[PDB]
Amino acid sequence: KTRSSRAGLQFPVGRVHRLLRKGNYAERVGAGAPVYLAAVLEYLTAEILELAGNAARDNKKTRIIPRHLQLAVRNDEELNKLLGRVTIAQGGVLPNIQSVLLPK
Amino acid sequence: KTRSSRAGLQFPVGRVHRLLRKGNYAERVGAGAPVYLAAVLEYLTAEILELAGNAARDNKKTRIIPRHLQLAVRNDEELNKLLGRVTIAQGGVLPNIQSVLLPK
Amino acid sequence: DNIQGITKPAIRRLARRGGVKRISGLIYEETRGVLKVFLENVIRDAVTYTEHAKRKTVTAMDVVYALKRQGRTLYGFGG
Amino acid sequence: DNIQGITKPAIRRLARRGGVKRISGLIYEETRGVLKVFLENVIRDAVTYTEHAKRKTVTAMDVVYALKRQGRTLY
Amino acid sequence: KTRKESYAIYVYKVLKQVHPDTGISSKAMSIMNSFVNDVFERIAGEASRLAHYNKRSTITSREIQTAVRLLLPGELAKHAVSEGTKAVTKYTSA
Amino acid sequence: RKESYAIYVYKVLKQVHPDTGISSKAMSIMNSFVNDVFERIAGEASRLAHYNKRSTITSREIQTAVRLLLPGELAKHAVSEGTKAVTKYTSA
Amino acid sequence: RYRPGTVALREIRRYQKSTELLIRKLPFQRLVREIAQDFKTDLRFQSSAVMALQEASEAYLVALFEDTNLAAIHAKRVTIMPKDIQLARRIRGERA
Amino acid sequence: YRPGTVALREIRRYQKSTELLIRKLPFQRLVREIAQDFKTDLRFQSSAVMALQEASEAYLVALFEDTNLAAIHAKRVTIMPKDIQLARRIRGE
DNA sequence: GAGAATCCCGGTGCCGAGGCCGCTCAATTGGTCGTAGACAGCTCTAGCACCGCTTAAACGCACGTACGCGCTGTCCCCCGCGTTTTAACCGCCAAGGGGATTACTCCCTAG
DNA sequence: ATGTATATATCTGACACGTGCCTGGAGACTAGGGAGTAATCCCCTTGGCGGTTAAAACGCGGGGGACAGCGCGTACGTGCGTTTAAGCGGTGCTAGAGCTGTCTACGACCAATTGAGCGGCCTCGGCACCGGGATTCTC
């Protein structure tokens, strides 16, 4: 009977509707816009959860450390442009050494 | 009769009150906030207009060009760090020649 | 085709108003490349702006709010 | 002695995390001064958020908003 | 106690749905909680300004559709507008 | 009516520089400028209203916001002029 | 009479003194026309729009050439090379 | 004295792990004192101080990556304060 | 010592920047009430400070070798300039396709 | 003489499931005004004329600037002796963070009104443009 189950989606649609009502964005809100928000949110976390999963099995660890999502987010240019300006706590540096800086 | 003349300001209270009312910033708004924003705007265009008059008096011009307002923003470093992200149309840049480029 | 419209003396004038004294020949194609990708990004904003409003013209308000979108806004044509 | 509280080998580890092979000896005071004015610019916004919140101490979310302010958003 | 609002269980069991044998830590829940309300306020603002630029006084699927077609660099928008349209058609089907 | 701010800063300019004029292109430039600062400070007023759950915006919140985004001595002069403006409001 | 260079100094002084556009309008609106017709079909345009992107393009050109000037000064060179503008776009975050 | 091998292992050993470099108590008084500039005896917070620690570490590693890239541009590995001034001026400040 | 190349002083339409009336919405004033900000008062989390053992990290002196730097010979590729020539730009003329707005309406989103 | 190999046996240690609960999302009912459509007027810009003209393309003489190359010294890397004051962790104290209660006055809402800023029209002088003479780096 929940509207998220009626939409066939997993991310909640009443929660984002509640946050949209008192979030002071618009005085009138349509019905399909929170569904569209939940859809694009589910797609974004589905994509980086696939990325964190393949980083986790690349390092062979059952638990995704945030460092796994650092080298998951630095391995694609779309999120290198979407999350390039961001600053991450406990992120480290990806392995990148110039060829000229290496000896011989 | 006007609230700007009642508070001694020049920018109107009702117009900026309608601006902060229909612009969905807050459902409940204040009354000292529009007169105080009018005061802050009065100070801002006072500093801008005095800098523009200083940039126009030394160039011996009765009118203020976009070159004069460009000289008004790009000279004082406080306002230059305030609004340095915004470019000026038909403003140009100040004459800056580095010390290396000077022929000796 | 039509990318040489910003030809060599135009880039020379841009360099002279930019402050660079000496110009090599490889500067011109790189500068028009970054110009044709920067204006491509602005027009990429403007196409979604126009198709949002069901409006088939591009005004000065379109490019001014687009420059507001990439954080390089400009005064003179609305705020 | 707040300037020399931060150690030179800590700046060495920061340089080796940045990818610096050879580093000079006059870089430490200038790097410390740039870091001092950067943290002062951050803590100015942080302390105005503490006076916003009717609190006499600092918390998490004021530093969070102060990091979201100037475009180095904290994660 | 206080009723804290967090979508950690939602991300936790889409992780369990797509990766049935993978674990996670609490710092990770905090870190993509920061992700999803970062993008939630970012794209909620974007659409807001846009619709106000359009001078419209509401937020239906159209404004957020052009906002998510415009905002993020690529690829994820190409799947995202398709899957969002498919989501709103299963909503209107129900 | 099509709202603008022409006669306002014309009166302000006659107050500060009574023998100086300005052009219409520059008038549009300062129109874009006043719209920019108004939208910036109104967005800041909304977000630091939203930070501490306060549904009402008063003078002290956006006072701290102009202490925030403006640098030092301009913020001092702005807050002094703003405080005297609201006290000559509330005196009357 | 014949100099290695002094006309360039007078030219940069006059161009920093002046504020007029140095980019011709017809090739500019021709190239944005080609980009717009490459993206979509049958678009309309305004004149204030194309002088607005003219102002944006000249401001971005002024900023990028100031960037390459400072990078060439710190590189102890007078002639400019595309390595400086490549490092300028890499440092500023325009490409990465 | 073996030159370069120990430095290469050093570069790999803090480009592989994610350890903290700045000590917590020096930086503590540092920011505490920068805080006193605005609020004295400012009761502080552990989340606040590791927020400043990670923000300062990220800014330091970004500025130092900028510095060594523009030094490798300048055909010289070593670092001068004019390189830091160039990186600060070009990057926006 | 000469010469292109500047700055400076004087005439000339002009056409784009100041007033002014008409007046139409928009800021101003007054009444009403229901809720949110502010103050008082309340319970405990957590920040501050100090003591003491452990010890790995930090300072300091000694030296050694590649690398920053100083100088040099060299192509050679950009820079000033004469000669076509080729597209830019100004003045203008008509179309017609698209932007604004009036005007009812109904449904779907506020409550 | 000693590692070790491969199974014990205890034995903690960090992690996922089975009960309460409360509160906010969903079902149902009422309203009104915000998009929806579309027609019509008007306005501007996209083509198309054509002259003419500053300015780009092209080729050629020449001169300092960039290229690799070689030597001089010294500065950071490496190492061991000697601190030291970071880290753990422990305890004691109390400010202040945070939640609840209650009040009341600033402020949203509504109806009438007056007034002042938008605009078409009108008028005129500041500045660019042109012409010719003084003046200053440069060869």
Swiss-Prot record, chain E:
<dbReference type="GO" id="GO:0030527">
    <property type="term" value="F:structural constituent of chromatin"/>
</dbReference>
<feature type="glycosylation site" description="O-linked (GlcNAc) serine">
    <location>
        <position position="82"/>
    </location>
</feature>
<comment type="subunit">
    <text>The nucleosome is a histone octamer containing two molecules each of H2A, H2B, H3 and H4 assembled in one H3-H4 heterotetramer and two H2A-H2B heterodimers. The octamer wraps approximately 147 bp of DNA.</text>
</comment>
<dbReference type="GO" id="GO:0046982">
    <property type="term" value="F:protein heterodimerization activity"/>
</dbReference>
<keyword id="KW-0832">Ubl conjugation</keyword>
<dbReference type="GO" id="GO:0000786">
    <property type="term" value="C:nucleosome"/>
</dbReference>
<keyword id="KW-0238">DNA-binding</keyword>
<dbReference type="GO" id="GO:0003677">
    <property type="term" value="F:DNA binding"/>
</dbReference>
<protein>
    <recommendedName>
        <fullName>Histone H2B 1.1</fullName>
    </recommendedName>
</protein>
<dbReference type="GO" id="GO:0005634">
    <property type="term" value="C:nucleus"/>
</dbReference>
<keyword id="KW-0158">Chromosome</keyword>
<keyword id="KW-1017">Isopeptide bond</keyword>
<comment type="similarity">
    <text>Belongs to the histone H2B family.</text>
</comment>
<keyword id="KW-0544">Nucleosome core</keyword>
<feature type="cross-link" description="Glycyl lysine isopeptide (Lys-Gly) (interchain with G-Cter in ubiquitin)">
    <location>
        <position position="90"/>
    </location>
</feature>
<comment type="function">
    <text>Core component of nucleosome. Nucleosomes wrap and compact DNA into chromatin, limiting DNA accessibility to the cellular machineries which require DNA as a template. Histones thereby play a central role in transcription regulation, DNA repair, DNA replication and chromosomal stability. DNA accessibility is regulated via a complex set of post-translational modifications of histones, also called histone code, and nucleosome remodeling.</text>
</comment>
<keyword id="KW-0325">Glycoprotein</keyword>
<keyword id="KW-0007">Acetylation</keyword>
<keyword id="KW-0597">Phosphoprotein</keyword>
<keyword id="KW-0539">Nucleus</keyword>
